[model samples]
Target chain A: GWGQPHGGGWGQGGGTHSQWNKPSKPKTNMKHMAGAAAAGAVVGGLGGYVLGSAMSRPIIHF
Target chain B: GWGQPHGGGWGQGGGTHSQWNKPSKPKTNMKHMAGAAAAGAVVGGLGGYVLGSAMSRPIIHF
Candidate 1:
């Protein structure tokens, strides 16, 4: 109907063509990513433990 | 108008709700991201050098 929702460009800054800087990782950086992995693994292991426990129960029913 | 091109859902698996897996990083991972940053920096630096050289020529003309 309405010309298929127009897309937008990514270039953030305008006019100034000053020296470009290095690419900075947004949302999460490498340092946090390392910690996140460690934390995530711990949490994932716990969740897996719970899930495995539940699945173990269901299997026993048969 | 063709009914505005319908959107799709994201759940990959169907029917059987087996144990959910951990969030795997798609497209790029931390290891590659680090290496990519290093490689991107080197390439970007070279491009900047070339751009600076060309801009220097333009500036000299004025």
Candidate 2:
């Protein structure tokens, strides 16, 4: 079994430490996050639009 | 060993939706994100403080 994936370690250049374990969202920094959100939203919205459009198609029509 | 953890799939009731995979941040709504960032920062900052304080307590007689 793979067991559980490891999170991070201690004191390795901010490593994971409590710094990360601080209980919150992740993936990057706040400064980076704002930009990420905009980009993410655009892509997300685009993806939603595409998928929604696709789903709108009927597998079979009467 | 596990190859890789799976991310998510499609059309699961926005389960992941392009909404999530929009290529940006995640975990919740962006509305929630600002809150998360603030919270994360506090924890992260606190963790840093604690960790930094601990590190500062190293070998007195190096």
Candidate 3:
């Protein structure tokens, strides 16, 4: 009956373990990125000039 | 070999180019000015109404 692993609630096809009733995780990552660029501009501005110049400068020129 | 620029493959250390990467400039400028106006209106509205009406009236004869 509903007592064994694959025979009851723990089984693959039991009354409480139907494959069609599986719940999937909800996706909610889009809202987090909408205004991300604007936020990044403020945070990135502090180090952008220094880091950018450092990277662009040729090594031989040093 | 790849030795010419400086010392190593490309330059001093040749550390695999480890680098990283405003609002519409004009629109942003406009927005800034409009914001200033809104702020000024808040501060000057009270004084403006009083001073404005006083200035508009003609000098009365004694």
Candidate 4:
């Protein structure tokens, strides 16, 4: 079994402090999400339509 | 300033012949696009139990 892969150090005592470790300021002046509703609506609409059409098709052979 | 709003072509030799030209189609078969992905999904899920159940939730607080 491939035991969980490893690489990074375990403790904060070695290489230069990671830039990612720097404290970041809380997000401000946020913008309302755009196109979220459109995306959801598109997905919902597509899912429903496909399912409906599939079940409605009649299978017949002559 | 709304000075750019204007109708009709900037230059024309005559004022007659306004009928839009219609091109003739060659011998070929054309079929309407079967319910597009999104449209089909919507109509398809119309009878879906998950959606129906979600919409049928009780509104009265207990």
RMSD of each: 26.7, 23.6, 31.7, 30.0
| lDDT, candidate 1, B1-62, per-residue tens | 32222233222233332332233342332432211010101121211111000000011110
By descending DockQ, how would the candidates be arranged?
2, 1, 4, 3
TM-score list, all predictions: 0.14, 0.12, 0.11, 0.13
lDDT of each: 0.20, 0.20, 0.16, 0.21
Order by lDDT, highest first: 4, 1, 2, 3
- Model 1, stretches more than 4 Å misplaced? A3-27, A30-62, B1-3, B7-15, B23-62
DockQ score of each predicted structure, in the order shown: 0.02, 0.04, 0.01, 0.02
Give me candidate 2's interface root-mean-square deviation.
23.6
Off by over 4 Å in 3: A1-62, B1-13, B18-29, B32-62
Ranking by TM-score: 1, 4, 2, 3
Q: What is the per-residue lDDT of model 4 for residues A42-61, given as tens digits with 9 covering 90 to 100?
A: 22222221111111222222
Model 1 lDDT tens row, A1-62: 32222123223132322332233332333332211000111121212111110001011111
Top-scoring candidate (DockQ) = 2
Q: What number of backbone clashes does candidate 2 have, counting pairs of residues 3 or more apart or in separate chains?
A: 1
After superposing candidate 4 on the true structure, give the runs of residues whose Cα lies further than 4 Å from its correct spot: A1-55, B1-21, B29-62
Which model scores highest in lDDT?
A: 4
Q: How closely does chain A match the true chain A in each prediction, as TM-score? A: 0.14, 0.12, 0.12, 0.15
